[PDB]
């Protein structure tokens, strides 16, 4: 119609970031990661192409939460079976498989489209062990707004 | 017990994807210039 730059393939470049959740409050460190994954921090962001970069966590066993949500806030799950309600994990599931805890939290703030599912596959969370992606030269983001 | 809706030309051609016949063995006769059936014999196919 007029003049409006539209980002496409073979014209955009993605990078690699590394955030640390040592003294974060999950939710606050999840909303700031979703924006980077969606690429809403660039001046050439289009809502029809995959724009943004990848994020990597290295401390998913240090995440904390204020209030009595560590004993409450239970997680439910069904298996499409008569009485398949699964709520074995509650708020103290940060000791057993804590990578899923952050994974779900950051995956619960993204669009449920065909492009919103492939944008959630650019995040790698680790309990406490170091990441094996040393050939990607990831930049240390750490500091959050 | 009666079709609620009518099928289209795409859903009807999708059901006829396996409806076909397989190729035969065609055991070429050794030397007679004919064709004998797999593990069989003919008046033309010598072998």
């Amino acid at each position: 119609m007029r003049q409006t730059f539209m980002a496409n393939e073979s014209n955009i470049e993605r990078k690699w970031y590394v955030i640390d959740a040592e003294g974060q409050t999950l939710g606050r460190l999840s909303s700031e990661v979703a924006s980077i994954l969606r690429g809403k921090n660039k001046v050439t962001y289009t809502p029809h192409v995959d724009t943004g970069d990848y994020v990597i966590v290295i401390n998913a066993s240090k995440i904390e939460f204020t209030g009595n949500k560590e004993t409450d806030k239970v997680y439910y799950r069904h298996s499409n079976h008569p009485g398949g309600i699964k709520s074995i994990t509650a708020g103290e599931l940060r000791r057993t498989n804590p990578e899923r805890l952050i994974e779900n939290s950051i995956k619960g703030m993204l669009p449920s489209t065909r492009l919103g599912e492939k944008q959630g596959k650019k995040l790698f969370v680790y309990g406490g062990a170091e990441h094996p992606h040393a050939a990607q030269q990831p930049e240390n983001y750490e500091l959050r707004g | 017990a009666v079709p609620k809706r009518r099928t289209s030309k795409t859903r009807k051609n999708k059901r006829r994807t396996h409806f076909k016949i397989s190729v035969p063995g065609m055991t070429e006769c050794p030397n007679c210039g004919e064709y004998k059936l797999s593990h069989r014999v003919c008046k033309n196919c010598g072998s």
Binding site: T4, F5, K42, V43, T44, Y45 | -
Partner: protein, 58 residues
């Protein structure tokens, strides 16, 4: 769309869209949101100077 693009190119200079716009109207400047975003994607130098003009006008 333009608003989202201008808001992302205004956080790089430690500023906010709401604030940037407020100060851009106090300095008496008539510019479209489609043009502002078009300049940010192109000549970045121009945009940089504009921010300073709307920063001392607050």
């Amino acid at each position: 769309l333009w608003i989202t693009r201008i808001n992302a190119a205004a956080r790089q200079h430690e500023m906010s869209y709401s604030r940037l716009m407020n100060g851009l109207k106090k300095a008496g400047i008539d510019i479209n949101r489609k043009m502002l975003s078009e300049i940010a994607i192109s000549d970045e130098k121009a945009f940089a100077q504009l921010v300073t003009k709307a920063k001392d006008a607050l």
